[PDB]
Amino acid sequence: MREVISIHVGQGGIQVGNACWELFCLEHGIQPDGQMPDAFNTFFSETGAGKHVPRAVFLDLEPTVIDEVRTGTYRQLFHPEQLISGKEDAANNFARGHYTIGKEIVDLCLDRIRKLADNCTGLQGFLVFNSVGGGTGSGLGSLLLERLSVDYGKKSKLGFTIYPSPQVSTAVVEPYNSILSTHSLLEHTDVAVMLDNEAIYDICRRNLDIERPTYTNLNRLIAQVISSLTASLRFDGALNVDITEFQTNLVPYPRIHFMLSSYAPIISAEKAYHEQLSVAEITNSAFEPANMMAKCDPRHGKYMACSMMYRGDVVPKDVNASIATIKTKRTIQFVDWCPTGFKVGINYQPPTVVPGGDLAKVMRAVCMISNSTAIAEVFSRLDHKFDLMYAKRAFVHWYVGEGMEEGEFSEAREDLAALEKDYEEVGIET
Amino acid sequence: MREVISIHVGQGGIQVGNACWELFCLEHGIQPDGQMPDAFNTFFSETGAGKHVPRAVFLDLEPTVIDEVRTGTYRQLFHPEQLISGKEDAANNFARGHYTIGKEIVDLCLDRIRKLADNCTGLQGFLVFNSVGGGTGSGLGSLLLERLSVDYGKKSKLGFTIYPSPQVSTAVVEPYNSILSTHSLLEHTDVAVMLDNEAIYDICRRNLDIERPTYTNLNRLIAQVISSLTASLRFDGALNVDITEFQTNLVPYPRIHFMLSSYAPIISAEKAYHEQLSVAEITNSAFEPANMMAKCDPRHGKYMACSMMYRGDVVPKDVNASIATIKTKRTIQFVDWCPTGFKVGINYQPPTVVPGGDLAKVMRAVCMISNSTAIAEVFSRLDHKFDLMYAKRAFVHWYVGEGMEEGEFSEAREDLAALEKDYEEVGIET
Amino acid sequence: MDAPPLNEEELNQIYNWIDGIPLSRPKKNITRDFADGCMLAEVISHYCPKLVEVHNYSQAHSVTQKLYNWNTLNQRVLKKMGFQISKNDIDCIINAVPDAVERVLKVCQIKLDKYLDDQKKKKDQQQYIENAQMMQNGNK
Amino acid sequence: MREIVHIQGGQCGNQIGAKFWEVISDEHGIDPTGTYHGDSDLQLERINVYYNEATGGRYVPRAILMDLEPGTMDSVRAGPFGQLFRPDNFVFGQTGAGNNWAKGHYTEGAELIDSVLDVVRKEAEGCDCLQGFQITHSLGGGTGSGMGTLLISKVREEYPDRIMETFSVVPSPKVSDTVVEPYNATLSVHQLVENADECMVIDNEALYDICFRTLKLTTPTYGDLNHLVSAAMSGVTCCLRFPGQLNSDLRKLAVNLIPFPRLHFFMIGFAPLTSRGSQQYRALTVPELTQQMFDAKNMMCAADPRHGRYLTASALFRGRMSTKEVDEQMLNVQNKNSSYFVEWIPNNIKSSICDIPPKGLKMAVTFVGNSTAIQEMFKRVAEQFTAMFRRKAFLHWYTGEGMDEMEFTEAESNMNDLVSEYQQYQDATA
Amino acid sequence: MREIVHIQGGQCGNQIGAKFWEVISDEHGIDPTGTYHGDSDLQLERINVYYNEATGGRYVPRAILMDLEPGTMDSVRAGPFGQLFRPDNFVFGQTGAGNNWAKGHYTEGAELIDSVLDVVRKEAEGCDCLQGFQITHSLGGGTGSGMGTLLISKVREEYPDRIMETFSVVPSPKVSDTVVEPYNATLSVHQLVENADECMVIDNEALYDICFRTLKLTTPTYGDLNHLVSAAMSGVTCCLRFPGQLNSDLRKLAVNLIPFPRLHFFMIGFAPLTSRGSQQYRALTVPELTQQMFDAKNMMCAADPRHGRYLTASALFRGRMSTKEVDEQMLNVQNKNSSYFVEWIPNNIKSSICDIPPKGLKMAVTFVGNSTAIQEMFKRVAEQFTAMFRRKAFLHWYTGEGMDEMEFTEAESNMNDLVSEYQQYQDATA
Ligand SMILES: Nc1nc2c(ncn2[C@@H]2O[C@H](COP(=O)(O)OP(=O)(O)OP(=O)(O)O)[C@@H](O)[C@H]2O)c(=O)[nH]1
């Protein structure tokens, strides 16, 4: 009687949704056709006899990815008319997907959301995935969040956004729409998790020893993180954690809800079994700055609160004996007004392996969600990138001619300045 | 209702404790498992049904010997948590085992001592064994004696210390810690018995006819001496002696309590039965200078008091007829202010033989504990050895850097000078 | 920062100033011991402990980590004191070029004294305003 | 007669009850199917204390299980002895509290509590002679610490003359699993002092310490902590279900252990506890039980009892033993430790004897002592609370559901006043 | 417990370790696949000294391999027992030093050493109780003699109380393979005296002399020299891994063999060594071992020990033998050679016995003696250094990487001061 609905918008969102939906189907024993040859209820729904239907909706204005989905092996799984598709792409223009073509599509998506919500009885909250540096992704994510915040109100929404890397970039105009989308979801999303690609590339290179990774390898790690986060809702555990038990433990103030994640262990089968993978060493590896899932240095800032999930055969006393060691270290310092900052969850189900993938099978794993003061650097560098081109009003004509006003750029800049001032104000000791 | 507790500290102490604890278990009929297949109460305690637990505690900072004990045939005998073990050895450094690592272990030992003492109702006193020429042995023995002297007060403590040989030595720095430990136990121990290895090597070579002895052969003789000393507490005898009846008979003055021991007969089964082993000949052999258990010449000094124990079928009149003969001889002279100097004890239980050992089974034996003025030579030679290296302050940096002060070496030298002057002052006739 | 070479008297003044500070490690060679930027962070933290998070500067032998420490110090600390070190001067310091660190220490000393005086004036002015406001509320 | 009903709330309380009822059923010989298969006549005489009778001869506990989420009760039903609980007593909501005290006490807990109060009233009105209620809950969670404490006030308002027990687990700062623990701990302690007749604090840190040091088992789990807590819980009411030399119900303990109505926070401990390998070495005697009973490490709380003075103490011996030995040992434990007992109340130790020992053990002891050393827990809880509250961290979650900061200030002030007036009597002299 | 980690640098050190680890694995019965196949129980009791445990039951050495070029570690991996080493511990650069000390200590070695120090810190922080570190490197090479010695200082700065071992091969003038050997030898000796707790010099010339004269084999190779060095290395820590009559860890040797903190340069030797054709003629007895042990040609250094006087000596006997014979032989070897032993420190020979002999041998001895004859090596090294430096030959290579001639002058002066003050005690008399 506990449910959650995941929203996938944009090319990156759909490509990570595919990645998480192989993993969930594999973890619950459901074949790609949707047929089994009481834990499924969190992500799926029973049709009365036979197949299961995911509680997910796919959105995009550009039809190529959806058409690829509707012809692959998973054509029989998803309901045919929840893969909403458009005709014309926003083409990396934020104003297009927020004012011009997204408005005519958003009504169908909201109707689908209502039709899925009326089925659930214990709706925990929503999940949303969107790559920020694109037109349709950021614009439609903003519009959907704004509609949901007023249609439903206090229901919790979680956002797994992928911000651009510090120096590596695929587009040339992504700072503009990244800043605008951050403006939009700052006052509209309860949790936002950092996911830039460069850090995960470094993780793959160093640990998985892959020298030529593709997007699928990144999306599989993200899917594993999602599964670790939501395992506690569908498996028995000695110390459970619910989604609604987050803003009471990781969010000191309503404005501050951007945090960065990490995962451990990450290791290949060729050298995994030569070492014992004790809980102490994995919880040490999870706190290593080089294993952050976002390219930010935690040594440059304080910690505010750490929520970290275990799964497997871990015993609570071993967890406490390792939290003490971390509190001992002099290179990790917490904020003054937080004496204890750890929330611990323990689950029994070990992580599942996907055949043909990178990760091996292990009995212990740890996933941490940590809120730290050091996150302000990404905001500062994105702001610096934005200012350089906004000084000469470059690329603005592509946005003014799509219905957006001239002054809309300035207030996003002011909100980022306010956020940066707030992060500095919080981190000073009393 | 009479009890005694034995303390074993250091490698030599533990290795002689093993030697005495085979002998006691064999003498009281207790199997190595601790099960019998009212005299046991002096050394053991009844658990209510079945096994017996020794009233002994084993101490060491270096874990090898204790681990060897806990896996041998006697693993079931000792209580699992009275074999206190450390992690880091003192490494022949006295300052280590008195100031650095011994302090953190001494509290557990004192707790064990209290837990053993509350069980006893008629506690006669303590026994302690420690090889003096080592770091942990001397340091922990000093610290334990100093704690016990104030926790309990007037209870009697007996020390079976093993001083280094005149010329034969295993270490190079043992005079320093030997002198310091003599300083420590001079004002803290009621009885100290001399046990250097060279004299016992000569005894084995001459009598037992063993040309390649090991430490076990030495420890068996020491165990036999201990058994002869404590036989009077647990067996019926015509002339009993208690531990508390020593400082009234062997200790003329509070400072002078170092005495040297001897044992007779020592003979192998191959030629033991060819001669009658009369009481007169064994009591003559016991007074031979070559049969001293410490390498000191009694012909170089006066006697102060002789306490000598018999066991077997000896008759008191034969003992008196032999004390008269010894008083007759011109090569043995007593001090002027002591007309009679003999304390005699007679017990009925003959000494027990250990299978596979060196000594044979005999019906008569004699053990003497004699206090003589000639003991000052070992102090003088140890002092001479100490001065040679202390002139140039050699090896001092290994002690100053472990928390000990510079002046601590001088006052031990002054106390030895005081002791040597006292021994000369006592031995002059009026 | 094209600062002139320091004379022997100015060098002795800088060394005596640095020796007056209780640093975490004994100094043997100022040019090498400051090349990682950690000792300059400690020097500034002694006078301005709220300005410098010394734990952000790890001891470093690698050029990459020295350059990270110096860039972080230059952007977060020195810029707030109203000066910045040039990239070329940072490159001279990390390579232990003679006189490079001594010039930076001289500039840092002068800028630190000025920064402390300006902080004192701000406190004295704020205390005057707070005292003046308390006297007006007592009359109300 | 004089029976009590069981009420538990939250996940921690449900897990405690899931072992408490197993222990009780094993003690009374009740199979997991509700059928009696015991051996002794006494096993059925006073079964009305905890069990009701239904048609078909089976027995059903009079327990009430409540939580704001259905997962924990859906999991406890599948465990052993899970079928005994009546399905009608299961009451749950569909939303949960998310470790937020305000949600579990003002908005969500207020509407649901009517249904659980209905069944509570049904259970209490029916029973022969009420003795009272016992409550198990955790102070580290939102729904538990809110709904349980509000239910305490509601029950007290309707049954002012009955007795009320609470077994409360307080969040220790060593093993912290939730970041918002200080807020709902401080808020709960405010309400708990005003209504609970007895309170017994239990700490996970002390349970881990006991499991690691006394039992010496390698991998502690929540099952062992629950088993220890269950044994301690059963030990208190043993003499109310079995004959004995000096029967003593809960009200008699309430009279003798609470000097002033606001000083009713006890810490407990259970003896004997021995490792598997040393269970054959030890002999069970009254001195052995009483020496472990007053041991500082044996307390179920991290509070150090030699940091303060006992106001009073209680012991509930089990098994057949002589009363003279018990009284003399209680006198001896009070003469040798006069410094740790307050002097203006003489003879401050209560004893009781029950002739029925636990299944598998010949003697057992339950210790309940009211000591001044408990101040340290409230001190550290308030320290963390005031460290976190001064910055108003995580305050918006609580203030968004009708609560204000004034109730936080009053709670802090009342808790500090309790801390002060509890130690006021520590320095009091006659 | 009390275990040590292995760190090696340079080509010579890597080749020494490649045989040291083979010898250790053969001693403990570990197959080249990491699987135990031993015969005796004692082979596994203290395996934690050198080997770690991983999942699957295999063992992995705690060794760290570093070099400035990848060739040597890429070659050692393909050799026997090369798979035991963890691939993560391999750290290397892409440039090399070219036998230039400045490049391996100032420019290239400084940037790389952070990565190797990271894994060194990982290894040391984790282990149960640290005993210390042992270092193998050569003074005749640039990268080795630079990076190893700088790593010595870095380790000493972080672990001032642990013990540090260094096995150093110094360039002899007889067999010279590099023209710039004096420069980096003199520079390295300057830093090595300040930080190393123990140093053991080994010379290729002495190894060739031993192989040609004692073993009498026709064609010596580096494998034989490595095997002799490996046997000598293993002999030192044997009693720390096996039981014995007198256990003596490394710290105990440090206490007894170093009179003053700057005199810690020992020369070693191993006995017995016999030819293949004469291995049947000889009979292994303690006199035969001790006569070869003090033989001048048996020393692992070309230094002639009858050109000076021993300050102290040590012997580590292996196998089961009588202690009386060992002590009397040690006394005899010291009475017949009184002219070669310093007179102001009496009894300057330390002995130890370990009951576990090497595989294939019944008795073995390792000799470690601190003698004044070592001055001759520093004399000739300084002579060559001052012959080459006076013309500033090859100086530009060093001075082009930030180094100056002042550090050469200080190094020469400190080395000459060491030479002088080491012989100062040779002429000292009492
Ligand atoms: N992690 C991850 N990021 C992706 C992936 N695909 C695209 N991105 C990121 O998405 C950003 C651009 O947005 P896209 O998702 O590609 O395109 P869009 O969101 O659909 O917006 P449009 O361009 O209007 O179609 C790029 O900067 C990429 O970094 C992916 O498969 N994995």
Ligand SMILES: Nc1nc2c(ncn2[C@@H]2O[C@H](COP(=O)(O)OP(=O)(O)OP(=O)(O)O)[C@@H](O)[C@H]2O)c(=O)[nH]1
């Ligand atoms: N009689 C006898 N003496 C021993 C025996 N073992 C060691 N010793 C003596 O003890 C002296 C050194 O002290 P040890 O007992 O060996 O070592 P320790 O007392 O534990 O001190 P540490 O070296 O710090 O461990 C040596 O000079 C030996 O003469 C033994 O078995 N019998």
Ligand SMILES: Nc1nc2c(ncn2[C@@H]2O[C@H](COP(=O)(O)OP(=O)(O)O)[C@@H](O)[C@H]2O)c(=O)[nH]1
């Ligand atoms: N003894 C015991 N304690 C538990 C168990 N499960 C959780 N806890 C403790 O309960 C605390 C969390 O309480 P919580 O589950 O949030 O209570 P709730 O909010 O009422 O559901 C943790 O700090 C744990 O130490 C268990 O099975 N046994």
Ligand SMILES: Nc1nc2c(ncn2[C@@H]2O[C@H](COP(=O)(O)OP(=O)(O)O)[C@@H](O)[C@H]2O)c(=O)[nH]1
């Ligand atoms: N025992 C031994 N010595 C070696 C071996 N290889 C080289 N050496 C010695 O090492 C010296 C050269 O050291 P080098 O290889 O330059 O050290 P690096 O600069 O650290 O690589 C030569 O004088 C050799 O005598 C070997 O396999 N065994």
Ligand SMILES: [Mg+2]
């Ligand atoms: Mg697209």
Ligand SMILES: [Mg+2]
């Ligand atoms: Mg020892």
